[PDB]
Amino acid sequence: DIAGLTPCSESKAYAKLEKKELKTLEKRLKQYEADSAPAVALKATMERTKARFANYAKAGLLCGNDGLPHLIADPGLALKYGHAGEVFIPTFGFLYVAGYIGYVGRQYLIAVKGEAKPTDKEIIIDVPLATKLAWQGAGWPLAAVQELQRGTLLEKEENITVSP
Amino acid sequence: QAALYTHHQYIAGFIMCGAFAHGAIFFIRDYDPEQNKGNVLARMLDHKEALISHLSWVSLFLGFHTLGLYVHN
Amino acid sequence: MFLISWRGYWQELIETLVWAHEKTPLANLVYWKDKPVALSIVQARLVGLAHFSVGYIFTYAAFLIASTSGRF
Amino acid sequence: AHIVKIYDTCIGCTQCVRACPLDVLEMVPWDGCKASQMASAPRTEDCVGCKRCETACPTDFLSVRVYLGSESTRSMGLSY
Amino acid sequence: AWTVPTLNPDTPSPIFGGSTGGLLRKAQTEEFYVITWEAKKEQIFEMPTGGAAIMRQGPNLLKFGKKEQCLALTTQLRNKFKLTPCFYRVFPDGKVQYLHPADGVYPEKVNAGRVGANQNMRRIGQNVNPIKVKFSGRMMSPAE
Amino acid sequence: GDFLVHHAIALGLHTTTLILVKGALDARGSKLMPDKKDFGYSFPCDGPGRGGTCDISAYDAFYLAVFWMLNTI
Amino acid sequence: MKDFTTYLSTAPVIATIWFTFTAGLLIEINRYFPDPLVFSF
Amino acid sequence: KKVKIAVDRNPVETSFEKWAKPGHFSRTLSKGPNTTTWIWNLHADAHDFDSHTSDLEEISRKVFSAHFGQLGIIFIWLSGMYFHGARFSNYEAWLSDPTHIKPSAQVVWPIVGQEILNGDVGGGFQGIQITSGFFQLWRASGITSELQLYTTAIGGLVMAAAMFFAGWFHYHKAAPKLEWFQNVESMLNHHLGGLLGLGSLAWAGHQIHVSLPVNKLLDAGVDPKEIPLPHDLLLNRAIMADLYPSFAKGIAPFFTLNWSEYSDFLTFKGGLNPVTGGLWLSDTAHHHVAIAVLFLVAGHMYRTNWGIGHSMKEILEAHRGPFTGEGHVGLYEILTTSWHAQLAINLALFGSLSIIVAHHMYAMPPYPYLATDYGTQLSLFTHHTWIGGFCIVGAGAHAAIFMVRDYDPTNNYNNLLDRVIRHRDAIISHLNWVCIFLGFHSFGLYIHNDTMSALGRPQDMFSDTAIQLQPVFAQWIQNTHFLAPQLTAPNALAATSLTWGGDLVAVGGKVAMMPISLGTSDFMVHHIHAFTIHVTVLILLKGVLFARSSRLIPDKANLGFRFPCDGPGRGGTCQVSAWDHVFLGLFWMYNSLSIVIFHFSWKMQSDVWGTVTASGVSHITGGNFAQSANTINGWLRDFLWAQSSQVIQSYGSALSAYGLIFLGAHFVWAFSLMFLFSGRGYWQELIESIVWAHNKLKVAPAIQPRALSITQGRAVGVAHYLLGGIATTWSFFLARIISVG
Ligand code: CLA
Ligand code: CLA
Ligand code: CLA
Ligand code: CLA
Ligand SMILES: CC1=C(/C=C/C(C)=C/C=C/C(C)=C/C=C/C=C(C)/C=C/C=C(C)/C=C/C2=C(C)CCCC2(C)C)C(C)(C)CCC1
Ligand SMILES: CC1=C(/C=C/C(C)=C\C=C\C(C)=C\C=C\C=C(C)/C=C/C=C(C)/C=C/C2=C(C)CCCC2(C)C)C(C)(C)CCC1
Ligand SMILES: CC1=C(C/C=C(\C)CCC[C@H](C)CCC[C@H](C)CCCC(C)C)C(=O)c2ccccc2C1=O
Ligand code: SF4
Ligand code: SF4
């Protein structure tokens, strides 16, 4: 109960929706022989379904009046009430990989600018240079702040403009 | 209530796009750089690429993640 | 039609219509004062945007008024 | 009629005249480039404004420049 | 040597069965444009109005409604056939006007004596702002 | 749903201002057409040259913003 | 086969190998770790 | 020998060295990128072989081996459909009950919840219900086991490898010379004789010896593992004489010309098999026998190496009259020296074939248990009409490519083509008139019915209970084709289809086919079709005839087939090329064929399809086509709104992917309107403003970002428009008809 909400292990619409999905799977299962190949896949779907409900109720997700889990996207209401794995932990688990790709592509461009003709190594990617920059880009925030402290991250007004 | 809200919201949308339309007519017909040496109206054109690129970033982020969460649901 | 089709298809169509009018018997008597050309490029934009906006507003106005005042 | 002006960035490579579908343009003696020649627009009454001249100009920020003006029966390109 | 040739309609037309792309009432009321060329041999050329005609040996005369049709015909006669055509301008009151090679020399070659109209002795980035040309009577470009 | 649609509204507002601010600031010129102020506010194009210049004017950037405006409203 | 390895290093071939790699990594993850809505432990 | 094999040994060395160099085919693209337009020109100019080189021999070699590439891909595709029919299907179950078991041949992997798409298709099986009709083909061929499907899938892989090896051989190792390809008389004799004639003779052999006895034992009612295998039907004449008692006489009635004794298994029944709702396979057997004899006669027409036969140049140059000048002179030399002129005619007649196939496979359903599978019927009609309409627009495109590139005024003086160019204004003006006439007198009838139904005046409408517009001519043709077994085809036991009149064939409680009444709404929709087909002809033929010149641009052929414009001048010249005309004709082919497939999907659901109880048969939509398709609001309510009520609530079921694509193709379609409405000079300046941001953070690419080309953005817009509209209608149709059909 952060903003009119309720834990999903407490709310009854969540359990009613679990029983609704298991009821649809059960009346779907009632047509087949108990050991046939469709019935095995239907019971495996039931097992994945029940494991999904158990692990959404276990992590302390907040349900609403609809019986559906919600995501508190504010630190200080996620850190204080234990919901940092909703948004606040994957908002850095994403940005590590985002700045990773943005650093690997940056360094692949800068390490191919100073050649004979760079464009041929942009349609035909130099794979050993690409995999070297793929592995050694693991510490990208480190190298990014060390590049920002120089001023070698930005370029000055050598850039191309029109008519200011 | 539905008619009045939708009425004044489309009136406001057309008037707000025409605000920028006549703001674009200003820079062609009325703007003088030698009369506007260094003011806010010239610094606006000076970093116009930063303005358009940051609006492009905000729009591209909002569309990527709004459409992504809707298609996900 | 004003948005996807652009002017130059239509000028080539209007030239064949000018041919058909200026070679038809007894319609040669009737002649224009303004030479028929297709709508210009900026004009094609404005006409397509005008029909787009008028159809947009009339569709949603009919839907809004009927959808609210039908059940209420 | 359309406004066809040229500018002194002309290198005299006479490509606008060959690109012109209406003989608006022609090459005039001049002493501002190596080719000793510059274009001219004496016949802008016949111009339609199709801008083939400034698809063919090699100089960065084109030396020929067509400004779409009033439209007569020759500027609209009419056989009728 | 060369001084402004004249025209007679006595010169034949190339053999052409007639298309629907020919002249209109603009030819009879406003103007129509005639083209002449001397051909060396009888050969087939594409009409700018659609269709193929065969030109005959000697002088030819063919009439169009646009200057672009006549200059397109000169463009394919000078390139594919290496001929030297010239087209004129005929008004319905019989007044004829020499239009193509004014000085005899084709316009992509310097004749040393034609005058440079519509030239700006300045760079195109050095145009004034439109605020400086405002209220010039009519609406006006900064290139003037 | 109101989270998602307020971010849809923010997408629409930022994209409509992207089109309108880009039309107002590039109204005087761009790298594709450095003398756009010489042609005025409303003009078709600058021809097929330089890659093609369909919808290059500031009028034609108001124009594309009316669609995103009607979308937003 | 040096020319074959330069063909293998072109843009669409690297694109269709790397996208199958990053597809069939996330697909094996969502097989062995079903339904990750929230960062658990 | 004038007609002889003539090749060149080892013309092109097989090496991966040119795979390393993209753009090797083009003189301009071989220098590499400097600009992102390069990589779109790489894929756009990839198969335009006529612009790579000028040697017609090299062009013909490239297009002859590219056809082996397409054939290898089709054999991979067919072999995959046989393999997915073998290993992932309920076809074994479907053969025992082909009325309550849905045909399924695609199973998904249970990962992200997509295993809900493995629906309960029946027969102890879960998968996606297919609608491509392969199971009805396989029953009509006499398959009866997934072993035969697996082995013909292996044969399809072998034949795909044969096709790929063949293209490699006939391009790299032993490639044919130019005057090999120019033997069109030999190509027509071999294709009418060997492809069409011997192929239908061979399918006649398979139908006589394999599919007639197997399907007769199926229709009598025998388990498929109890049926003799077809090699036991070849070897044992006693089983075939038990099934058809004239196999005891052998091939003696064929050579004594006592062919009437073969009337046990070559029939002229007509109508439908009432056991299964398909055509009689004895009737299709005699069909392919007669087709085989006809095309083997037709393939001995043209002169190749002996003095007998016709030569097509002498056929063309003889057919000339007083009205048409020199007649067909010169058409042989342009249909032998131009591949685009061939591809125009072939795409035209082949896309007409697809539509004739689509109309001839609903009314005369040729497969067992095809007609009561309503989903297969709807998807086959829709599929083949779309393939036909695309091929007709490609005909209109490649005719104009011939006009721009390969047309020569020297070879064409006062023939048919020159005289058509010289009255193109009359052609396009009269077609403009008839399009405007058809538009008013077809769509204004719908606007009139809208207005009268809205103004409270239903008596003043155009309907059956109002001002009637009866299709007297089509009704008269229906009467004559229903009375054709009386005196104009006296050896027909029934009419050639059930649409002409009579009773209904009912299979499994569902109507296979019943007679189709043609009323006022049928009149109005057939004139909507005539209108939209004439407008598509107007646009495509205006692009062909004005491909080289017009009064607007007299030198359009120097600008090319695919050019954006000739600038803003002379009023504006946007979209003046022939490419832009086939661009605009693609929208009208979409417009026409969407109404064609809507008229099918609502005429069949209203007046043909539905369950029968032998108690006054109740159709699917209750019989509201003639009663409610008078108005645009009737097509809105009772067709789009009413029948979208199964694609919109398909979530949480096996049809839910159709619920997703119906949204997604609503996306892509509207996404196309970003490309169709906007223009390049916007996006190039937006790319400048973000190239600045990539310059500021040192991440500007060396291949410089450009906006899409004008005729590229038009191509992207029309491609996304067609995809998003056709896939919307795809998902709508299939989610409707799998559920309620
Ligand atoms: C206080 C309000 C106001 C004022 C005084 C002006 C004044 C001006 N504007 Mg501006 N403008 C405004 C609001 C305003 N605008 C708004 C709100 C918008 C956004 C829609 C615009 C968008 C705009 C553009 C894009 C342009 C102008 C231009 C102009 C100038 C010329 C006017 C003109 O072309 O008239 C003539 C106007 C018309 C003939 C209007 C066309 C008809 C429209 C499309 C309505 C059609 C709807 C239809 C009738 C509905 C019927 C339905 C049917 C079924 C019954 C003038 C200085 C132009 C300019 O300066 O040129 C350089 C120019 O290019 N304005
Ligand atoms: C449904 C139609 C539609 C859609 C989706 C868009 C989308 C967009 N427009 Mg708009 N636009 C439209 C119609 C549409 N427009 C119309 C009708 C017009 C009038 C011509 C315009 C005029 C217009 C202008 C003038 C501008 C935009 C801009 C934008 C962008 C805004 C940034 C954003 O939201 O990025 C989010 C991206 C998306 C929502 C689409 C991406 C879809 C997915 C995520 C991509 C990947 C899917 C998948 C992997 C691909 C597989 C393909 C294949 C392999 C099978 C975005 C690309 C602006 C822009 O460029 O901003 C930078 C801009 O300046 N548009
Ligand atoms: C009776 C002989 C015969 C037969 C059956 C064919 C059959 C075919 N020809 Mg063809 N052709 C022939 C003689 C023959 N040709 C002659 C004599 C010439 C020279 C004048 C040509 C010149 C020619 C050209 C230029 C082209 C064709 C093409 C085609 C294919 C059309 C596509 C189709 O319907 O796929 C139907 C598919 C099948 C029938 C699958 C069965 C495949 C069989 C086994 C191969 C075809 C029979 C083959 C000719 C026998 C030779 C065996 C080989 C070992 C020598 C088709 C396979 C086109 C094509 O697609 O090329 C690949 C094409 O571009 N033909
Ligand atoms: C619903 C949208 C719509 C409509 C009505 C039209 C209408 C038309 N298109 Mg068109 N088009 C459209 C969308 C549309 N288009 C789109 C989206 C594209 C994009 C690719 C095109 C591309 C296109 C091309 C490329 C061509 C056409 C052509 C035509 C004309 C053929 C029909 C005709 O003459 O019949 C008569 C007119 C109608 C059926 C329109 C409705 C009139 C109703 C029935 C009655 C009249 C109203 C009544 C008198 C009341 C008047 C009230 C008073 C106050 C004025 C017509 C002007 C063709 C053409 O002009 O040549 C013939 C042509 O070549 N269009
Ligand atoms: C929190 C709050 C508050 C506050 C509020 C505020 C502060 C607001 C503000 C707001 C704002 C602050 C707004 C603004 C807006 C703006 C706008 C809307 C603008 C626009 C612009 C434009 C449109 C432009 C135009 C132009 C151009 C284009 C360029 C140049 C020229 C011109 C200028 C014309 C209070 C406490 C009171 C209360 C409670 C709540
Ligand atoms: C994951 C991802 C994402 C997202 C994405 C999205 C958002 C998408 C969407 C999309 C949409 C929003 C829509 C779509 C749609 C699609 C479609 C729609 C497709 C289609 C295809 C096809 C292939 C088709 C086919 C067909 C049919 C079915 C019909 C007719 C026939 C044919 C064959 C043509 C992100 C960015 C986050 C990141 C990266 C990745
Ligand atoms: C949006 C739009 C553009 C902009 C579209 C740009 C130019 C292309 C869109 C991006 C393409 C898809 C390239 C992005 C993918 C690259 C290949 C990089 C791939 C990186 C990884 C995914 C491998 C136009 O250029 C245009 C031109 C004419 C009329 C309308 C429009 C138009 O509407
Ligand atoms: S403009 Fe370009 S082409 Fe015309 S003259 Fe100057 S340089 Fe030669
Ligand atoms: S194509 Fe570009 S340039 Fe040519 S006319 Fe259309 S808009 Fe103007």
Side-chain angles (χ1 to χ4, degrees), chain B:
Chain B
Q1 280 281 91
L4 288 173
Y5 186 80
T6 303
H7 177 73
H8 288 93
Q9 283 280 313
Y10 279 98
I11 294 298
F14 276 101
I15 290 174
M16 281 305 295
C17 66
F20 287 95
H22 290 282
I25 302 169
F26 167 73
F27 283 112
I28 294 168
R29 286 183 174 180
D30 295 330
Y31 182 76
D32 196 359
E34 292 86 3
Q35 187 62 255
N36 285 313
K37 294 293 292 295
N39 56 1
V40 62
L41 195 60
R43 297 287 184 180
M44 193 190 301
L45 290 170
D46 195 0
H47 68 284
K48 62 179 180 293
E49 294 90 2
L51 282 166
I52 299 167
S53 64
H54 279 86
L55 285 171
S56 174
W57 181 74
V58 176
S59 62
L60 198 64
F61 174 75
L62 285 168
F64 276 157
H65 291 89
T66 306
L67 182 64
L69 296 182
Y70 272 114
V71 174
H72 181 84
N73 299 325

Side-chain angles (χ1 to χ4, degrees), chain A residues 28 31-33 36-39 41-42 45 48 102 105-106 109-110 113 117-120 122-124 147 151-157 159-162, chain H residues 20-22 31-35 38-39 110-111 115-126 654 688 691-692 695-703:
Chain A
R28 187 181 176 188
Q31 290 179 355
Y32 295 102
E33 288 85 3
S36 66
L42 285 172
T45 305
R48 290 190 295 268
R106 176 188 175 91
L109 290 174
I110 297 171
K113 288 292 174 67
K117 187 167 88 275
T119 62
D120 286 332
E122 291 183 353
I123 55 167
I124 304 165
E147 189 175 3
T152 56
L153 186 64
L154 292 175
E155 186 172 0
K156 278 79 177 175
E157 290 182 355
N159 292 319
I160 176 173
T161 60
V162 183
Chain H
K21 293 182 179 179
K31 293 184 285 186
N34 200 1
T35 283
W38 186 85
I39 79 167
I111 174 173
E115 68 269 13
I116 192 166
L117 300 180
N118 293 323
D120 296 333
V121 296
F125 186 79
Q126 284 183 352
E688 295 169 359
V691 157
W692 182 82
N695 277 315
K696 187 70 177 177
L697 285 172
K698 291 181 181 180
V699 286
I703 300 169

Side-chain angles (χ1 to χ4, degrees), chain B residues 63-65 67-69 71-72, chain H residues 383 386 660-669 722-731 734:
Chain B
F64 276 157
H65 291 89
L67 182 64
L69 296 182
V71 174
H72 181 84
Chain H
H383 178 78
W386 283 111
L660 289 177
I661 298 168
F662 184 77
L663 290 177
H666 271 89
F667 181 78
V668 177
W669 182 80
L722 288 174
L723 181 62
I726 292 167
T728 296
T729 307
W730 181 81
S731 59
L734 291 180

Side-chain angles (χ1 to χ4, degrees), chain C residues 1-6 9-10 13 17, chain H residues 428 431-448 531 534-536 538-539 542 575 580-581 583-588 591 676 721:
Chain C
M1 188 160 67
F2 300 94
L3 278 159
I4 297 166
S5 302
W6 292 358
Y9 171 75
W10 296 100
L13 192 64
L17 293 173
Chain H
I428 299 302
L431 186 54
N432 203 160
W433 175 72
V434 72
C435 290
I436 294 171
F437 169 72
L438 284 167
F440 283 112
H441 291 78
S442 298
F443 183 68
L445 302 180
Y446 282 90
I447 302 300
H448 183 88
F531 160 63
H534 277 86
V535 177
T536 312
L538 173 61
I539 301 163
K542 181 179 179 294
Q575 292 180 359
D580 292 319
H581 288 80
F583 162 73
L584 294 175
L586 283 168
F587 294 100
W588 275 88
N591 189 19
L676 294 174
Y721 195 94

Side-chain angles (χ1 to χ4, degrees), chain H residues 359 362-363 371 374 377-378 381 499 511-518 522 596-610 619-625 639 643 737:
Chain H
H359 279 84
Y362 79 93
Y374 293 161
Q377 282 288 320
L378 181 63
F381 182 80
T499 64
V511 176
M513 204 71 208
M514 71 176 291
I516 298 173
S517 66
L518 296 174
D522 283 315
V596 175
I597 64 178
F598 286 174
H599 166 48
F600 182 78
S601 177
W602 192 26
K603 187 68 174 175
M604 291 295 108
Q605 288 179 359
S606 175
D607 294 332
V608 174
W609 291 344
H619 296 93
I620 293 175
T621 63
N624 55 3
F625 184 77
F639 182 73
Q643 301 180 1
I737 201 64

Side-chain angles (χ1 to χ4, degrees), chain C residues 2-3 5 7 39-49, chain F residues 63:
Chain C
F2 300 94
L3 278 159
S5 302
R7 177 240 169 82
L39 308 179
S40 69
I41 299 170
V42 167
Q43 182 175 0
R45 270 72 162 270
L46 182 59
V47 170
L49 188 62
Chain F
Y63 174 71

Side-chain angles (χ1 to χ4, degrees), chain A residues 71-76 78-79 83-100 140-141, chain B residues 57 61 65, chain F residues 3, chain G residues 36-40:
Chain A
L71 299 179
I72 300 299
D74 179 70
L79 295 174
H83 295 92
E86 289 180 349
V87 176
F88 180 71
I89 295 169
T91 187
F92 294 96
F94 175 72
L95 288 180
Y96 181 75
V97 187
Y100 189 91
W140 75 269
Chain B
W57 181 74
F61 174 75
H65 291 89
Chain F
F3 172 80
Chain G
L37 180 59
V38 66
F39 182 77
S40 65

